[PDB]
Amino acid sequence: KAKAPRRTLDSYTVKPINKTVKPGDCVLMRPSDPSKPSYVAKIERIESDGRGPNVRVRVRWYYRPEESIGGRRQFHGSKEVFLSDHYDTQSADTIEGKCMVHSFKNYTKLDAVGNDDFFCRFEYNSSTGAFNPDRVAVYCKCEMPYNPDDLMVQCEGCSDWFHPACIEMSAEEAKRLDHFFCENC
């Protein structure tokens, strides 16, 4: 035929996806390695190219810890991602499904975490490898940042929180917790 103009869309819905997305939404996008886990992205813009025609999506990349320069670390959550310097444009049909990037705080407040739920406490730099903020709060004797996956427990003099394994204690110890005092007290 002949081609229609390019148009920026309020929203786009895909039959394969079966879900309808708008700008500002977070999505999972198939990487070229299909076995590889989905890329997490934030949709800045949706646009249709009349030539194809096809739909292009301007995405800002959310990096996984294992995609970061530093690599994954102990205090890094399973569903943790960093908002990154990296922008790209992808096909609309590379989208598997919608997802939610919560604030670290709101993620902590979540009753149950599904494969859809993620959290972000770090902004990220793709070239340098810088983090913003450069540091957060730390806890226990390991003096490491908090991983919401893991279980900690509070006390009195310290009123700090501890990994049981870090102090001989059981995973099972704190259930039967009349209460907690730690040596530093």
């Binding site: 399973s78 569903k79 993620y107 902590t108 979540l110 149950a112 975490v113 599904g114 494969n115 739920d117 908090y146 919401p148 996956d149 893991d150 279980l151 900690m152 427990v153 509070q154 929180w161 704190a174 917790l177």
Partner: peptide, 8 residues
Amino acid sequence: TKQTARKS
């Protein structure tokens, strides 16, 4: 105690 449990 602090934890967010993941189930689905």
